[PDB]
Each structure stands twice: as C-alpha cells, then as structure tokens.
C-alpha cells in the first residue's frame, strides 16, 4: 500500500544502522543501507517520495519507495 | 576614483555604500527592484583600484580622518591601507600589481588572506565583535602602525574594517546587521557563522546568480535563498563571471532541479556516491 | 536493442533490492546495485537515458547523456 | 539525548578510522562508514544536523544523527 | 599514455558491470567499480578528465584517470 | 605533520586503486577507500582540505584529512 506521499521532512541515521524518514507527518524506517544516500539526495532536492509497505502505521518499516520530481 | 564611507549614522553609512555600488556595478536584469539590486561589477582592467576614505567614526566630526583603504575594483579585495597623514600606503604581499601614485608604498611581508589575518590577529571572524568603539580603536591601531610586517593589532583592525566596507558592499545582509552598531544605542555587531559562510562563497554565488530567472529557490553549497526578497536582502554586488574566483571545476554553472537553481558542483558533490552497502563493506 | 530513450519519469527502490525506472512510458528494472545512484542522479539532473537490452523486464546496460 | 545541533563546521577522517565532525562548537566522532557520505553531504549543502547519543560528553562517539534542510 | 583529455560526451553502464565514457571522440571502458559515480558526476558538471591507458584507440580499457579543474 | 592545506588542484584514480590529490603544489596518495568520494566532493566544491601525514614530500601517502568550509 501507499503509506505516505510527500517531501522528506527530516531523515535520521539510527544506532542499529537503520534509517528513518518523516513523510506527510508519519515516520518510517528502513534497514536497506542502499536507501540511505538515495533518500538524502531526495531530501536535499525536494523529491516527492511515496513510502510503500504492507504496514503503514507510523513507526513501521519499509523497503519500497518511489522517487518523483515535480 | 575615490569614495567616502561615512560611519556617522546608519543613513550616512548605507548611503555611502549605495553610491559606491552604483558607480562600480550594473544591476542584474532579473534581480532588481527599484534601485536595490544584485549588481555585477563592471569590467575594469586588472590592477584597477578605487580609494575609500573612512569618515564619521566620531559622528559628524572631522577627526579620525587619515585612513584610506585601497580596494581592487574587479574583486573588491582590500590591497592595503593608506595613512594620509604620513602619505604611506601599506600594501599586502599579494597586491604588488596595485600601484598607487603619489604615496610612499611599503610592500609588506604579510598577505591579505583571511587565514593569515586571523592567525596574526589571534582573532576568528566567526564571533568577531565590531562596534563604533572598536572601529575607533582599529583606526588608531592602523595610524600607529609602521613597518613591513603586520602586527596583531593592525591585523585585528584590518579584519574589522574589511568586514564593514568590502564585505558589506558585497552583502546587503552584512550591511543590515552591522549598521545597527552605528545607532545612538551603540550596540555590538557580532559576525555570525552565516555571515562568514556568505563571504566564503562569494565567487560561487557570483557564478550562479546571473542564471537566475525566477526559480523558487537558489542553492549554492551551504547557501540557500527561497525567494527574491531573500536574495536581495542578502546579496548586493557579485563578481563579473564573464575572474578566477567564478569557476572551481567543470563548465556548467547551474542545474535546475524541481524549480530550484542549484550550483551544478554542489549537486555533483552529493551525487558521486556509489551503492552504500558496497561502500561501507569495502574497507 | 535500444529499449527506451528519454528522461526518467520516476524511479523506485523495490523490496527485492532491485531498482525500477520509467522511461518513455515503459517500466524497466535492474538488479545491479551500482545503477541505483547512477539512475537517481540521471533522474535528478535531467539526463537522457537509453535503456539497452538483448530483449526489451530487466536491464543491465544504460547510456547517460546530459540534456 | 540531543548532543549538538547546527551546521557542520568541519569534518575529518583520522588515521585510526574515526570520522570527526564539529557541530555548535563541539566535536564528536563516528566509525560508521555509512555516515561519512551522509555527514559530508550535510556539510557541503548546509544541512542542520542533530547529533544524538545516550551521553553527550565532549570527544565521544555517536551513531545517531538527524538531518534537516533548515 | 594520456589517450584523451576533455569532457565526458556520454557514459554507459555495461552488461559485464564495466563502465564506458566517451572522451575526445573515443570510447573507453573501465572495470574499476569506484570510478562509476566519480565519472558520472564529472560528466554532469562538465569536468575535464584525462584517460590514461596502454592503448588509445576507441574501445580501449583504462584503470587510471585524472580529474582536472580546466 | 600538517603537510598541505588548500584546494584540490586535481585528483587521480591510480592503477593500484589508490587515489591521489594535488594540494598546495604537492601530490599525496591514499589507499583509504572511504576517502575517494569525499575527496572528489571536496574538489568539486573547492573545499580547503588539510593533508596530515608523517612525511610531507610530494609522493607521500596519507590516511588523515580534514575538510574545511573556509
């Protein structure tokens, strides 16, 4: 499901080497290391990201995300 | 050409700076409102300079009036200072190409870089305080200075005077923040990390702003502008990038990304990473 | 064969650690991890990409051109 | 705890495989290589970083940091 | 030898995971993984590169490249 | 010792996979894999870097480098 769509409000590297983003008021974390710089690039450039997961409760995990420009 | 910068009041100070800008630069077509613009320094031959006479350190009084700054016109660098009482031009070592007629030229061992000046001055620009009082102290230090090698107090004086003349000419932000110190309250201006970063990114800003065509934002390294009022409130004069400080590497000034004008080198500098898992495991 | 040529309309990191891009109305995916930053960079800076493959599904050859 | 918040004043990689950043007058280090490109990008783009650690003593290590555009 | 000096005219990721750049009208490939993003960023900014190789004909391999500020 | 402090005049990927930068007229190489993108990022943005090493003659190796904003 599409859990959240919008710009990245903040990102955060976590002590367990997971990575959190806040999108449309909701926070999600990923353990996929490859997503860390990609999400940062998206955050820096104001990409619209779509967090996709089987669970969309804020604080849940994700491993699928779409990147869109304006 | 000679210009006065009169520190008597905020009015006289801003008027002085505006007159200099009008004479030495031309507004950008796309960053100009009324007579308040980001302006490009008009081309002059290398070695061209203008003189700045310092006035009004004591409000509206014809005293403390023997300091002149020599400013290379194409880049607004301070090449040195003149004691007009002794008719002596103390010239930094990186400006042997600047020749001023009619004065005794003292060629100094000290170069003008902020690295050198901060070292000799034992004073960091980030957090540096400037007041009417310390500008008077700075003036007296420069009038007492003699010899071919900058002293600590002469270096502190140059740091303060370059900030409130050349850097304020470049950045309307520094003009606005510093001018409060000239009011009757006599508060202290403290140079901020953001002020310092502006001065460190002048050339990069200068390469990017001529390309602006009303994008929703401008990003140049650590510098961000979100609208035209932020640009105008921050920047007043830029280099003519048609100067070595304009280009770092490559040949592409800007990339438009999501309606924001980026310095291309900034984007390249965070888009040059390989796959993160491969990076971190490949030790 | 040149499967698609144009700007990247969207990109997507997938749960199986592959990476999808949409080019000229068609979606393609690659399993090569180093193409993930290369493609996202191309998408952000407006490069024309040419997806190439034996049949035109997955790909592992792509040309990058500044616009 | 939030140890430091601000732009990155400098970063430094040391011979002993630690990566120091200075934020708001305070120095901290991390040996997570994941964080080196993330922190340097944050430095060169002027992001506001929040260094986070259980304890915030000077010269201590960290592996949690939040990234904000402003 | 210094085979080609100039801007990257195009780059290409290859099926065998090598990476090709066209410089001064000639194509060169490299198997050095770390050069892939470094070359692409040079490409996007117009950075001049010098390709160095035993042979300079189009289609030659390289393992050494200089990134210039020209 | 502080060997060199200045902007990166060029960078080079070497045949042995080390990475060379020219700073203040002298060339320095590093085998530290983490430094390759960081050094190119410095070169791209004209960051002042400080090369620190036990020998400072051109051709010396290094593993310690500071990335400055000024």
């Amino acid at each position: 499901a599409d859990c959240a769509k919008g710009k990245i409000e903040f990102s955060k590297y976590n002590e367990d080497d997971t990575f959190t983003v806040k999108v449309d008021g909701k926070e999600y974390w990923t353990s996929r290391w490859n997503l860390q710089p990609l999400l940062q690039s998206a955050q820096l450039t104001g990409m619209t990201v779509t967090i996709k997961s089987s669970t969309c409760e804020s604080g849940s995990g994700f491993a699928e995300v779409q990147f869109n420009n304006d | 050409r000679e210009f006065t910068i009169d520190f008597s009041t905020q009015q006289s100070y801003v008027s002085s700076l505006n007159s200099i800008r009008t004479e030495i630069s031309t507004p950008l077509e796309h960053i100009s409102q009324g007579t308040t613009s980001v302006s490009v320094i008009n081309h002059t031959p290398p070695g061209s300079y203008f003189a700045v006479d310092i006035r009004g350190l004591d409000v509206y009084q014809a005293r403390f009036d023997h300091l002149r700054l020599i400013i290379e016109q194409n880049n607004l660098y301070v090449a040195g200072f003149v004691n007009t009482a002794t008719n002596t031009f103390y010239r930094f070592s990186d400006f042997t190409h600047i020749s001023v007629p009619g004065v005794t030229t003292v060629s100094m061992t000290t170069d003008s870089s902020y690295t050198t000046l901060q070292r000799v001055a034992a004073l960091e620009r980030s957090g540096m305080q400037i007041s009417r009082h310390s500008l008077v102290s700075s003036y007296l230090a420069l009038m007492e200075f003699s010899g071919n090698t900058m002293t600590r107090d002469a270096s502190r004086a140059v740091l303060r005077f370059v900030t409130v003349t050349a850097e304020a000419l470049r950045f309307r932000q520094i003009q606005r923040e510093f001018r409060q110190a000239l009011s009757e309250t006599a508060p202290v201006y403290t140079m901020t990390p953001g002020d310092v970063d502006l001065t460190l990114n002048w050339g990069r800003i200068s390469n990017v702003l001529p390309e602006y065509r009303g994008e929703d934002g401008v990003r140049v390294g650590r510098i961000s502008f979100n609208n035209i009022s932020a640009i105008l409130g921050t920047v007043a004069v830029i280099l003519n990038c048609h100067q070595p400080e304009c280009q770092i590497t490559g040949d592409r000034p800007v990339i438009k990304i999501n309606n924001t004008l980026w310095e291309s080198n900034t984007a390249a500098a965070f888009l040059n990473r390989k796959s993160q898992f491969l990076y971190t495991t490949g030790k």
Side-chain angles (χ1 to χ4, degrees), chain B residues 233-241 243-271:
Chain B
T234 308
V235 181
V237 178
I238 54 165
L239 288 160
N240 197 323
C241 297
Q243 308 293 309
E245 300 85 8
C246 293
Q247 186 257 3
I248 294 174
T249 188
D251 75 348
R252 189 192 193 162
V254 296
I255 305 174
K256 187 180 165 169
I257 310 175
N258 292 325
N259 299 281
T260 299
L261 201 56
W262 286 80
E263 180 203 62
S264 79
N265 280 342
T266 300
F270 64 82
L271 301 170

Side-chain angles (χ1 to χ4, degrees), chain B residues 20-123 125-143 145-174:
Chain B
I20 291 163
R21 295 185 185 115
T22 298
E23 291 311 301
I24 71 169
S25 68
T26 299
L28 285 175
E29 182 74 30
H30 299 271
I31 321 189
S32 173
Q33 295 287 347
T35 58
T36 302
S37 307
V38 175
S39 290
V40 181
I41 295 170
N42 304 331
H43 177 257
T44 62
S48 308
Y49 72 88
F50 60 91
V52 169
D53 288 303
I54 301 300
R55 292 291 185 278
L57 295 175
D58 188 2
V59 177
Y60 289 152
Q61 303 302 298
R63 71 196 279 242
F64 302 143
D65 49 356
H66 302 306
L67 176 61
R68 162 175 279 208
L69 305 185
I70 300 299
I71 304 191
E72 181 164 24
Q73 189 154 327
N74 271 335
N75 47 39
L76 292 177
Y77 292 152
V78 175
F81 56 96
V82 177
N83 180 327
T84 66
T86 68
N87 196 40
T88 308
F89 174 29
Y90 296 94
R91 187 175 68 180
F92 285 112
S93 70
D94 39 339
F95 291 88
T96 62
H97 64 284
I98 300 288
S99 297
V100 177
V103 295
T104 296
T105 299
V106 174
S107 293
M108 294 196 291
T109 62
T110 312
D111 74 282
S112 78
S113 74
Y114 279 138
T115 299
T116 294
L117 287 176
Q118 288 180 118
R119 176 175 56 74
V120 181
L123 170 63
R125 292 200 293 145
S126 195
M128 175 175 59
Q129 296 180 342
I130 312 178
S131 59
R132 183 178 299 282
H133 181 263
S134 59
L135 286 183
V136 171
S137 292
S138 292
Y139 168 86
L140 294 174
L142 290 172
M143 296 299 98
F145 177 78
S146 57
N148 287 76
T149 300
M150 291 287 284
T151 59
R152 182 198 75 173
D153 286 350
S155 298
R156 292 173 170 194
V158 168
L159 284 171
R160 297 193 152 87
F161 267 117
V162 174
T163 303
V164 301
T165 59
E167 299 296 4
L169 284 168
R170 297 177 174 109
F171 298 104
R172 194 165 284 109
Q173 167 169 315
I174 292 175

Side-chain angles (χ1 to χ4, degrees), chain B residues 163-183 185-195:
Chain B
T163 303
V164 301
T165 59
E167 299 296 4
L169 284 168
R170 297 177 174 109
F171 298 104
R172 194 165 284 109
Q173 167 169 315
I174 292 175
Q175 168 185 299
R176 177 180 60 251
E177 294 162 342
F178 167 66
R179 68 177 163 74
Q180 285 308 330
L182 305 176
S183 82
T185 302
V188 181
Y189 161 75
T190 300
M191 190 167 204
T192 61
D195 293 340

